[PDB]
Swiss-Prot record, chain B:
Organism of provenance: Mycobacterium tuberculosis (strain ATCC 25177 / H37Ra)
Section covered of the full-length record: 1 to 97 of 214
Protein localization: Cytoplasm, Nucleoid
Subunit architecture: Oligomerizes. Homodimer; the crystallized protein is missing the C-terminal 105 residues. Interacts with topoisomerase 1 (topA). Interacts with Eis. Interacts with NAD-dependent protein deacylase NPD (MRA_1161). Interacts with MRA_0812 CoA transferase.
Description of what induces expression: Transcribed in early log phase, decreases in mid-log, and rises into late-log and early stationary phase. Protein levels rise as cells enter stationary phase (at protein level).
Protein name listed in UniProt: DNA-binding protein HupB
Disulfide-bond pairs as recorded: none
PTM-bearing positions, type N6-acetyllysine: K3, K72, K86
Residue(s) carrying Phosphothreonine: T43, T45
Annotated effect of mutating T68A: No change in DNA-binding
Post-translational modification: Phosphorylated in vivo on Ser and Thr-residues; the protein is degraded during purification so most sites were not identified, but at least one of Thr-43 and/or Thr-45 are modified in vivo. In vitro at least PknE, PknF and PknB phosphorylate HupB; PknE is the most active and phosphorylates many sites in vitro including Thr-43 and Thr-45. Acetylated on 8 Lys residues in vivo (probably by Eis). In vitro acetylated by Eis on 28 residues (strains H37Rv and H37Ra), many more than those identified in vivo. Also acetylated by MRA_0812. Deacetylated in vitro by NAD-dependent protein deacylase NPD (MRA_1161).
N6-succinyllysine: residues carrying this PTM: K3
Source organism superkingdom: Bacteria
Domain observations: The N-terminus (residues 1-108) is stable, binds DNA and is phosphorylated in vitro by PknE, PknF and PknB. This fragment binds DNA less well when phosphorylated by PknE. Residues 1-100 stimulate Top1 and physically interact with it. The N-terminus (residues 1-40) forms an intertwined dimer, while residues 44-83 form a beta-saddle which probably contacts DNA.
Length: 99, 97
């Protein structure tokens, strides 16, 4: 699923026009990204937690020379899948049914 | 930021009712989860890629008993942060102003 298709899907669920669904996706993404960039975590309960992490000084291998090099700490985004996302994908919980 | 706060911010950006922003968040979530569930990946370009992976043959120590067991294989969700999401968080690229 590419982003346009995500938007087509969301359009039918929301009963919006496509521009609205596009705005929603882009602005969900942007809200998340700006929070994390501030060092805040974002918990979308059930789905997962987006956060910023600070990778300590560590080792990596320099592709162009093959030498191991010690690279500097780096702040990185991460997502921890929440229990319900995991439960569903692992087969331990069924997806929501019409109700 | 909690989910309700994400919804409040989205309500404000979209100029919608809160109920609509709530639908937006929950149905974005459901669309992603369900695609990963059927084994497909969802690429939200810039942001990242949600995917399903198969963990096979992993060991673990049952911290109840202390004994090392092989854990039976499981399919798991994952998210790979996108190039641009990393570039903002790392400080490489500035956010749009």
């Amino acid at each position: 699923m590419n982003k346009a298709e995500l938007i087509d899907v969301l359009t039918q669920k929301l009963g919006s026009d496509r521009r609205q669904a596009t705005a929603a996706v882009e602005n969900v993404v942007d809200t998340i990204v700006r929070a994390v960039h501030k060092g805040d975590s974002v918990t979308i309960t059930g789905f997962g937690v987006f956060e910023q992490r600070r990778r300590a000084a560590r080792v990596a291998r320099n592709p162009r020379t093959g030498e191991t090099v010690k690279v500097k700490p780096t702040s990185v985004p991460a997502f921890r899948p929440g229990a319900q996302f995991k439960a569903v994908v692992s087969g331990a919980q069924r997806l929501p049914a019409e109700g």
